[PDB]
Amino acid sequence: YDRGVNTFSPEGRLFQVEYAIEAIKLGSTAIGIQTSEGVCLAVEKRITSPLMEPSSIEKIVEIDAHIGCAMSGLIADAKTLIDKARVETQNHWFTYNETMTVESVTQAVSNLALQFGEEDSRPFGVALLFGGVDEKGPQLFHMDPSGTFVQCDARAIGSASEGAQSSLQEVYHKSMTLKEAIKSSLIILKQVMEEKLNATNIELATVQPGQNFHMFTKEELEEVIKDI
Amino acid sequence: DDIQQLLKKINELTGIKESDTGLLAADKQTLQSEQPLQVARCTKIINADSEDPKYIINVKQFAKFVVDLSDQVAPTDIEEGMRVGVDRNKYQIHIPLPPKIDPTVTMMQVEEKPDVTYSDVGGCKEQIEKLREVVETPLLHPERFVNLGIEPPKGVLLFGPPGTGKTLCARAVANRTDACFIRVIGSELVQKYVGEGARMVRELFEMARTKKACLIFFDEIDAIGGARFDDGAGGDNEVQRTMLELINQLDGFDPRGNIKVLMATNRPDTLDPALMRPGRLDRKIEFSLPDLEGRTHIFKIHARSMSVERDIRFELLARLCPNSTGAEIRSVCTEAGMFAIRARRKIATEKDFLEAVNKVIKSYAKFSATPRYMTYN
Amino acid sequence: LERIKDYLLMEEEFIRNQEQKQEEERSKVDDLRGTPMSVGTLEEIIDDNHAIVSTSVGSEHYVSILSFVDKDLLEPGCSVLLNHKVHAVIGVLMDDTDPLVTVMKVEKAPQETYADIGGLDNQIQEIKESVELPLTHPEYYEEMGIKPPKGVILYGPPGTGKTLLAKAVANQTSATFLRVVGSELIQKYLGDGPKLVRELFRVAEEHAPSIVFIDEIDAIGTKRYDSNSGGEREIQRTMLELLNQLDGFDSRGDVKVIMATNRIETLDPALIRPGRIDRKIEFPLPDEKTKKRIFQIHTSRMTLADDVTLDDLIMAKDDLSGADIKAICTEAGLMALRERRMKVTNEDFKKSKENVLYKKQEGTPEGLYL
Amino acid sequence: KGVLMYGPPGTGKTLLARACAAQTKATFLKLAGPQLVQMFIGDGAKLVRDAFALAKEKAPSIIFIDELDAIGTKRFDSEKAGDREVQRTMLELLNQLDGFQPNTQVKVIAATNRVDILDPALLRSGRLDRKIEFPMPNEEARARIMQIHSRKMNVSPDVNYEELARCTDDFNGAQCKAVCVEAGMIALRRGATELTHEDYMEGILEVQAKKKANLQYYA
Amino acid sequence: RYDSRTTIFSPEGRLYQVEYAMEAIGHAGTCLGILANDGVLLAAERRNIHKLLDEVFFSEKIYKLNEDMACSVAGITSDANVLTNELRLIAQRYLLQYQEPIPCEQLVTALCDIKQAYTQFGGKRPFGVSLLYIGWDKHYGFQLYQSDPSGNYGGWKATCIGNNSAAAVSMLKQDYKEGEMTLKSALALAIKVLNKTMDVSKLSAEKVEIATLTRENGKTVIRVLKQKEVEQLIKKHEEEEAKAEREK
Amino acid sequence: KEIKEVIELPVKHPELFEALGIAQPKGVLLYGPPGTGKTLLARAVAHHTDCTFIRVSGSELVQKFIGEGARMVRELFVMAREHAPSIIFMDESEVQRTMLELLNQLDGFEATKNIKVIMATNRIDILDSALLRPGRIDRKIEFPPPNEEARLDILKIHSRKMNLTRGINLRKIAELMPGASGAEVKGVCTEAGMYALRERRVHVTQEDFEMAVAKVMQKDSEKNMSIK
Amino acid sequence: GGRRFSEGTSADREIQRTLMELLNQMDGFDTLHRVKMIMATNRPDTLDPAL
Amino acid sequence: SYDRAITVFSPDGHLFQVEYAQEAVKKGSTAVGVRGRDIVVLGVEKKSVAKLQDERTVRKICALDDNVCMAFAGLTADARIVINRARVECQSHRLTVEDPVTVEYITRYIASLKQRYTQSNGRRPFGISALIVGFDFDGTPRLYQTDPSGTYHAWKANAIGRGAKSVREFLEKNYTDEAIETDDLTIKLVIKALLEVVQSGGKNIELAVMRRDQSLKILNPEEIEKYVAEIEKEKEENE
Ligand SMILES: Nc1ncnc2c1ncn2[C@@H]1O[C@H](COP(=O)(O)OP(=O)(O)OP(=O)(O)O)[C@@H](O)[C@H]1O
Numbered sequence A: 001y002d003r004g005v006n007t008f009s010p011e012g013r014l015f016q017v018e019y020a021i022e023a024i025k026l027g028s029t030a031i032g033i034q035t036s037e038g039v040c041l042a043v044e045k046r047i048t049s050p051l052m053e054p055s056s057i058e059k060i061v062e063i064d065a066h067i068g069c070a071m072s073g074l075i076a077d078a079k080t081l082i083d084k085a086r087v088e089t090q091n092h093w094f095t096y097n098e099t100m101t102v103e104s105v106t107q108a109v110s111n112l113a114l115q116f117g118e119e120d121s122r123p124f125g126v127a128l129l130f131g132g133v134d135e136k137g138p139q140l141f142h143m144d145p146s147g148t149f150v151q152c153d154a155r156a157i158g159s160a161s162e163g164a165q166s167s168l169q170e171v172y173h174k175s176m177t178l179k180e181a182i183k184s185s186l187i188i189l190k191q192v193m194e195e196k197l198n199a200t201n202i203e204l205a206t207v208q209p210g211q212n213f214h215m216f217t218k219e220e221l222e223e224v225i226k227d228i
Numbered sequence B: 001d002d003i004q005q006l007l008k009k010i011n012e013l014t015g016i017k018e019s020d021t022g023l024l025a026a027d028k029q030t031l032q033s034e035q036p037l038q039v040a041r042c043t044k045i046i047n048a049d050s051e052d053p054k055y056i057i058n059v060k061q062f063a064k065f066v067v068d069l070s071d072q073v074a075p076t077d078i079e080e081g082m083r084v085g086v087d088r089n090k091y092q093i094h095i096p097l098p099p100k101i102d103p104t105v106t107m108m109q110v111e112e113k114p115d116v117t118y119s120d121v122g123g124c125k126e127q128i129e130k131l132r133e134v135v136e137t138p139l140l141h142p143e144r145f146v147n148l149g150i151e152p153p154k155g156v157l158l159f160g161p162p163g164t165g166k167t168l169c170a171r172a173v174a175n176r177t178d179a180c181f182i183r184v185i186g187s188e189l190v191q192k193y194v195g196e197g198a199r200m201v202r203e204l205f206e207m208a209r210t211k212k213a214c215l216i217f218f219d220e221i222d223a224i225g226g227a228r229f230d231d232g233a234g235g236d237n238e239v240q241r242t243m244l245e246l247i248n249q250l251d252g253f254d255p256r257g258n259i260k261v262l263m264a265t266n267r268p269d270t271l272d273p274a275l276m277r278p279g280r281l282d283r284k285i286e287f288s289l290p291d292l293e294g295r296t297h298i299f300k301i302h303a304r305s306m307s308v309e310r311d312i313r314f315e316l317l318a319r320l321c322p323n324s325t326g327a328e329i330r331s332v333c334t335e336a337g338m339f340a341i342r343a344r345r346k347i348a349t350e351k352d353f354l355e356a357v358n359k360v361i362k363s364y365a366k367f368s369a370t371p372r373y374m375t376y377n
Numbered sequence C: 001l002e003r004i005k006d007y008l009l010m011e012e013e014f015i016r017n018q019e020q021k022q023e024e025e026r027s028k029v030d031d032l033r034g035t036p037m038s039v040g041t042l043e044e045i046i047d048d049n050h051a052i053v054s055t056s057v058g059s060e061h062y063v064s065i066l067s068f069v070d071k072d073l074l075e076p077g078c079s080v081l082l083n084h085k086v087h088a089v090i091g092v093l094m095d096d097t098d099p100l101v102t103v104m105k106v107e108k109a110p111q112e113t114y115a116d117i118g119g120l121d122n123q124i125q126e127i128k129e130s131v132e133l134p135l136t137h138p139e140y141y142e143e144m145g146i147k148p149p150k151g152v153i154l155y156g157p158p159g160t161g162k163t164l165l166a167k168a169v170a171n172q173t174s175a176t177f178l179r180v181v182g183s184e185l186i187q188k189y190l191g192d193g194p195k196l197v198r199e200l201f202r203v204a205e206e207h208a209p210s211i212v213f214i215d216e217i218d219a220i221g222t223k224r225y226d227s228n229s230g231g232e233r234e235i236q237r238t239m240l241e242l243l244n245q246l247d248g249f250d251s252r253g254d255v256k257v258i259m260a261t262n263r264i265e266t267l268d269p270a271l272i273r274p275g276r277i278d279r280k281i282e283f284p285l286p287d288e289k290t291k292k293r294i295f296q297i298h299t300s301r302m303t304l305a306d307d308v309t310l311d312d313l314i315m316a317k318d319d320l321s322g323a324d325i326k327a328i329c330t331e332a333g334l335m336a337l338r339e340r341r342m343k344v345t346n347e348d349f350k351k352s353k354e355n356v357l358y359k360k361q362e363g364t365p366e367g368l369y370l
Numbered sequence D: 001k002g003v004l005m006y007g008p009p010g011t012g013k014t015l016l017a018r019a020c021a022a023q024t025k026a027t028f029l030k031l032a033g034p035q036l037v038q039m040f041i042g043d044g045a046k047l048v049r050d051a052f053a054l055a056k057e058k059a060p061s062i063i064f065i066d067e068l069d070a071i072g073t074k075r076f077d078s079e080k081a082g083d084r085e086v087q088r089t090m091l092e093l094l095n096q097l098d099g100f101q102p103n104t105q106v107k108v109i110a111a112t113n114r115v116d117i118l119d120p121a122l123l124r125s126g127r128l129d130r131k132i133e134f135p136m137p138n139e140e141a142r143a144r145i146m147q148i149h150s151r152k153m154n155v156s157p158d159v160n161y162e163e164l165a166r167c168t169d170d171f172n173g174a175q176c177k178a179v180c181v182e183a184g185m186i187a188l189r190r191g192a193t194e195l196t197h198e199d200y201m202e203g204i205l206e207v208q209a210k211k212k213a214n215l216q217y218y219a
Numbered sequence E: 001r002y003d004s005r006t007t008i009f010s011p012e013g014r015l016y017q018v019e020y021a022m023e024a025i026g027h028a029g030t031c032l033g034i035l036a037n038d039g040v041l042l043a044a045e046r047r048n049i050h051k052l053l054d055e056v057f058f059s060e061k062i063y064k065l066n067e068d069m070a071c072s073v074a075g076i077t078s079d080a081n082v083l084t085n086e087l088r089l090i091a092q093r094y095l096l097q098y099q100e101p102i103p104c105e106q107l108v109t110a111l112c113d114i115k116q117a118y119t120q121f122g123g124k125r126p127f128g129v130s131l132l133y134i135g136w137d138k139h140y141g142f143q144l145y146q147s148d149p150s151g152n153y154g155g156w157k158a159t160c161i162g163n164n165s166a167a168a169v170s171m172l173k174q175d176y177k178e179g180e181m182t183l184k185s186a187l188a189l190a191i192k193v194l195n196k197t198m199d200v201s202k203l204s205a206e207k208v209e210i211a212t213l214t215r216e217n218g219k220t221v222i223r224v225l226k227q228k229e230v231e232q233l234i235k236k237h238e239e240e241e242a243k244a245e246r247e248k
Numbered sequence F: 001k002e003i004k005e006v007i008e009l010p011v012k013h014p015e016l017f018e019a020l021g022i023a024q025p026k027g028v029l030l031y032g033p034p035g036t037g038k039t040l041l042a043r044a045v046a047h048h049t050d051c052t053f054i055r056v057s058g059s060e061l062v063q064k065f066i067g068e069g070a071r072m073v074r075e076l077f078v079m080a081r082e083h084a085p086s087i088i089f090m091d092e093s094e095v096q097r098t099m100l101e102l103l104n105q106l107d108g109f110e111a112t113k114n115i116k117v118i119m120a121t122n123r124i125d126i127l128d129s130a131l132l133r134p135g136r137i138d139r140k141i142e143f144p145p146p147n148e149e150a151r152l153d154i155l156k157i158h159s160r161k162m163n164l165t166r167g168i169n170l171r172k173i174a175e176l177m178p179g180a181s182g183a184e185v186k187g188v189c190t191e192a193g194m195y196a197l198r199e200r201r202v203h204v205t206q207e208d209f210e211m212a213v214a215k216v217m218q219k220d221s222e223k224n225m226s227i228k
Numbered sequence G: 001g002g003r004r005f006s007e008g009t010s011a012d013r014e015i016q017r018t019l020m021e022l023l024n025q026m027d028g029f030d031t032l033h034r035v036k037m038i039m040a041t042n043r044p045d046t047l048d049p050a051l
Numbered sequence H: 001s002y003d004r005a006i007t008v009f010s011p012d013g014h015l016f017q018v019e020y021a022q023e024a025v026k027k028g029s030t031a032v033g034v035r036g037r038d039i040v041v042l043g044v045e046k047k048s049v050a051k052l053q054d055e056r057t058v059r060k061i062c063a064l065d066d067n068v069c070m071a072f073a074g075l076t077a078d079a080r081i082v083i084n085r086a087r088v089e090c091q092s093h094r095l096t097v098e099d100p101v102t103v104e105y106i107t108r109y110i111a112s113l114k115q116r117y118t119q120s121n122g123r124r125p126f127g128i129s130a131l132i133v134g135f136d137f138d139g140t141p142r143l144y145q146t147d148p149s150g151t152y153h154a155w156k157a158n159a160i161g162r163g164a165k166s167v168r169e170f171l172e173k174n175y176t177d178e179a180i181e182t183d184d185l186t187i188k189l190v191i192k193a194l195l196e197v198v199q200s201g202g203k204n205i206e207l208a209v210m211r212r213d214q215s216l217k218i219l220n221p222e223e224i225e226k227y228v229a230e231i232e233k234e235k236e237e238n239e
């Protein structure tokens, strides 16, 4: 019983990809917001130990100079998709003199989102949020281990993403601005979290057209923490 | 040794010369008038004969007899299967009495009214209204059902999360019952012998039919039976026959009458469609989690019976308890009260509510299974 | 020794225990009673001064009570006294004290009180405010009007002192105590466990406020036997009768449900939920300091010179228990009486130390992955 | 010799016993399954055989049988276990129903809900003669039953029952009865007037309580 | 539906084929390598000592593997022959590689990796064989190692075999010699070891085997010694039993 | 002598135990091969210490003599306190299960001791290690198979009270036996007496033992399995 | 008839002794004369090999 | 759903064999390791010599490169495979690039190979947890830990084996900033952790240091006996 990779449910699909989407929820949360001024993003680090060095844990990584990332779940598998995705974009620049568009990056990862094979290995359990600025301006993306990718206006993941997405739908509209989405985003963060909101808990990822570089805020992050 | 042995010898010497120092008409004549009364051995009737009594009767064990009534009877109501009074010598019948009910199944009538109020099951008001409509409205006010020519439902199914109020609704009706409420555990049909639970269902509905307009509650119906499993081993059999006997003696071939059954389970999936079909149970009134300020209503229920700080809120902890059950809610409210009992105080504080939220949800909803690994964050 | 005082007080208590008309209307009631007072069994009670009874073979009668003892003492399923003449109900009989009571209702406060502890006084505080304070001083519950916690779970390593704490609360008691071993709930019959639950907590309910303690309750979920008819679909139903019993209806009452396991992971989270058991209590192996307290208790009434340090028995083995320390004491006594001495010297604690710690202090068959 | 009622449990098999027992005036007799197998061993032989004596002395005997598969079981040879008295009462029913000493006055009707627990010897070729499955109300019988049960209530007749039987797929007459009764109580949610079409619509909406909104991965 | 464990942990977290393999190891004959500086020795126990055999093999537990190295063995015989032919293949390949003999340690760990790969992956029956290692090098001289099915090994001076040899190892700790390289005192000590632990009455030479490995000037010769000196070791050790009963 | 020390000294001298103030042993686990006098030992000790020897193995008969087979075995505590010099013996997880609960309430949850249980079996490991807690089981005593001199003395006991031939030897036979039980030697003696009886004699010759060792020799045979 | 159980239902004991009435008394030591035992069944696999 | 195959997940998505691989790690021998500002220092406990064997073969601490220092958890022979594998890997990185081989790269190798090794089928995963000390980039002291899942992770101090949260809580009760850059107080810190060993036997302690430019220096159980002497003497100063 517990029909894995080669048996559908009698109604729907895999009891194992259902276990992977199930296995997303144990991870910490992250909220990216596509502002037309530039996609911002944040994540809960959930630091345990005092010895636990804060910059040792990464959630936002820089695929391309205007492309950050955000993970949810299985760490080194996600980082494998990071390094390989950076290779694929480097192939697109290598053969096209130009950046791979972020949606086509997500389709490139989303090809082997479901290409798990133990014959002819295991499926993955990590959900992904992608921040970029392509030729169509800012882009905010969300895929899943099941490969069903969708562009999202502002997406919350991980733990407590129900109330995070709900309150996000309360605070969100089309003409949101950058620092508005930043301070509102960390409002939702210190709502959904359990720890005291300090510099250690979170980190930012800010891509803009004029600020394609530097999907980050460095210790003025602390200043925006004391701005609320 | 000298203190205890000497004091014990002193107490023993005290008890020794103490042991040596040691050396109605309430009804009595009426009982003496009851010595010319009669022993009145009750028996069991097989059948009568035509135009004459000529009654044929076993006692219970001895033998079977053609006998006659005494002439102090109502000579009509000496019918078949009727436990009646019979003389030791003359074998003459005196008075029919109601027969053997059961040894231990009389002991599941509730015979009381618990004080669970409809106001205390706040947060499920549609379930309250539909349960009010099925149970309370026909049994006390048949003012619209009969006066248009429609029927009330006879069966209502209940499930939900554990800690939602199946107990609250089942004991909530019993406050305002206006009916003989009857408790049924689904494991009550766990007997040893073959078809004994069928006899249990027999005397269950015989208790249901004598009294009119009454209540029977089914609780944990999973032990009563899941499905119609078939194998070459002979497994779930007495449960199966008792289950089908509960269907047939439930309803069909002259239905139950003016009795209502509420069923309840936690696994509504693994049930049989002979139970799941309507006619048996019409409104499948399910239960859900408190997802809104119904949580704060339950906080008002679990906070009104205690002195608290007047400057507290409940929506904050309600947002802190999204997926919580009301039993967990009462553990938070009464446990914060236990922090106030650890204090010398008399009114609890919102900080004590933070002690109970931050104590129960973190030390007894995350430490149950211990995580000793990060691997995720 | 003082054996003259002990045996003298024993024989004095025995003879004093062995030291165990004017009323005319009482003799008239004795004349209303027959000299062969027969014994009957109630079925139902009819209010017209006479009811229906049941004989030994089942001859059943509408007979009256000698109306000086009360008919409110009579309940359906009570043994009565019957006549032979009109078979009238003579009077109330004292009820049958079954082996359920004479085995399970422990009348004895068994052993030492809260000076038998090591690494405690938080869990003593939890059993105190969770059981003893609802028992002895439930006036704070008048001061606020808040429910007590219902159930207690003891869990940890074996030999920790779950037995010691159970007999400590069984010492400090004023409620009727019951003890059940959790391996006793599976028999060679169909439908026995649930009946044991119903009559068990029925007996726990009828007498008084009571303290029900059941130990090793995990031995119904992880144990299998060929001495079992049916199987997991009878064990599950026994867990369902314990389920509805523990979270039943109609004002459960002052019956403190206290249960003890070793492992915690294989248990029902529908039984771990609050409402059934509100005080889940961690039992660790406390500390290396109150080791010396358990050495002080377990060596407090034995002849013993100095000859040792307890730190020598602290920097020896990481886990710690009254089962460990007590086996050091008893095995050290076996070495001492083996060496026909009193005032136990160090080498008895040395060979007792190695004998106890090797005795179980080991692993699997060496090497492994040290 | 014998009429078998099998099929879905909502098609109505009590309806033909109550119906043809209601119409015909012969000696009608009922029977349940687990009422036969008793606590002691062999009482069902007494009960079945005395039932055959009583119906035999009441010659136009119409015996109805409810839950025949409750005692009708594909038996098994094994060790360590076995519930045999089911087959004892069942073989009492078989031999005392048919075989040696045949009768010409028994009339056998049975009603089950599943089929293949039964032995092939239980029907074989006329232990029960007729093998009568019960179909579901296809389209017109759904609105027919809705007309039968909606005959009693007071209706504001702006209701196309063929819309309702056309939209409702694969119900029984009990679920159509639930549509009509719950439609009456939805009309009683207003409480003012008679049955509107929307009352039937929302009563249908309660009976179409399949609401498994598990539309994931399917986008 | 036909899978054994062969690569999986027991439930709680222990191991299955390793423990049962060690249980196969304990039910075998007994060998030993003793403390010697000027060489090293091996005692051994003959199994299946029925008389109608031929005994023309001259080496049953002993395997002189390359030039100055041998190994007693305990476990499945022909599986062990696979491991000795593979072992001589490995160290002989090292001798091809450098034209220099092995330092023996990377050989021992190499064979531990050979069995160990069967422990991790390719779920078959692993080798339930533990076996000795004697030898000599330019870095530590004469050596003693113990193979394990777990991929583990021991750099010993007093080794261990299974059920017949636990009392022998307790005799090695309680009667542990140190400092003397005297091979003959090690022969009387080993004659005491096989005398008590080997339940053969009066220590028959046809139930035992002894062979040594000494240094000779650059050769490091291997004395697969014959039976008559074993016979005078029997009479000599029973003379030591007479010296033991002088106190009576 | 070990059982003298661990069992007779509780009977003979509680004053020496209570003199230093120790806890006396209460459970002695005996292990070894069958036929090694597992029951003869405890019956001889209970006989010469004057304790009621009890053997509760598995029967509804025995449960009917304890109670009526109603609920449990613990009325053995009643018949053991009322016969408080009580030595109990048990056979080879059901008997061990009953032994588990009996030891669960006799360890400190009882009255005046000299109530001791005794089980002799092989296969030490299949019973519980929590049963093998050192505060529960102390003296696991082995049973050696009888050696040449031990089968010689067993031979002299089981052969001494018979009618032997004038002119006889026994060490020859003790060297013929490669290991027997306490009762197989009795079969050698009695069936060798049958070998004299079929020769119409009552004196048992050496040849009768030569055919009797040939009779008991059928226990172990079957060579050409000299693996391991 | 049956075959055998492992001592399950207690009434099957009386079934077994009632069956061993046939198992002895069809054979006994005193044989039967002209007693033609005609047998009928549905599945003869479940019978006792004693029969 | 079951605790069998490394491929399937639980109904809440778990890998019980990774969890069981952490168990023999937690039931392994104890070893500690800290970084000094210049003199990084570590030491395993529980040497446990058994009177009849050599212990240079059971040495649990080695080096891949001279800048780096090896330790592990769990069992031995799988860690031997990882060590010789990473000798091939560090030596190969040395062959490709003439850099000194970095701790971050080699721990990406080990954690990555342990990860994909756990991914592959019918292959028993490594039940180890390595402790990797390297002071390379201008001698910048670094220490990483690994995981049976294969997640390389930096700490500032470390303790493994049985009671790792206990001795780790001692290092939380001992984490002074001045213990470093007073490398003799780092020596007293290592003697404080070996003093806070679960047995603290004094002879079963094996320590190794490096001053980020030196080699792996093995200590002596007489200097360490002087460290227990100044430890008990400093305890007498606290008295
Ligand atoms: N909505 C609610 N409002 C108030 N109290 C609630 C609510 N839901 C649950 N409770 C609390 O939880 C209990 C309600 O009974 P509960 O729901 O546990 O019965 P149940 O459904 O039968 O649970 P179970 O199937 O586990 O026996 C009471 O202790 C009550 O105080």
Ligand SMILES: Nc1ncnc2c1ncn2[C@@H]1O[C@H](COP(=O)(O)OP(=O)(O)OP(=O)(O)O)[C@@H](O)[C@H]1O
Binding pocket: B252, B279, D007, D008, D009, D010, D011, D012, D013, D014, D015, D111, D112, D113, D145, D148, D172, D173, D174, D175, D177
């Ligand atoms: N053809 C029909 N005409 C009218 N009403 C029908 C029809 N079929 C079903 N019904 C309705 O649906 C119900 C089905 O009948 P009923 O439930 O009494 O028998 P049944 O339980 O379905 O038979 P069974 O379950 O043994 O197959 C009846 O109450 C009736 O109102």
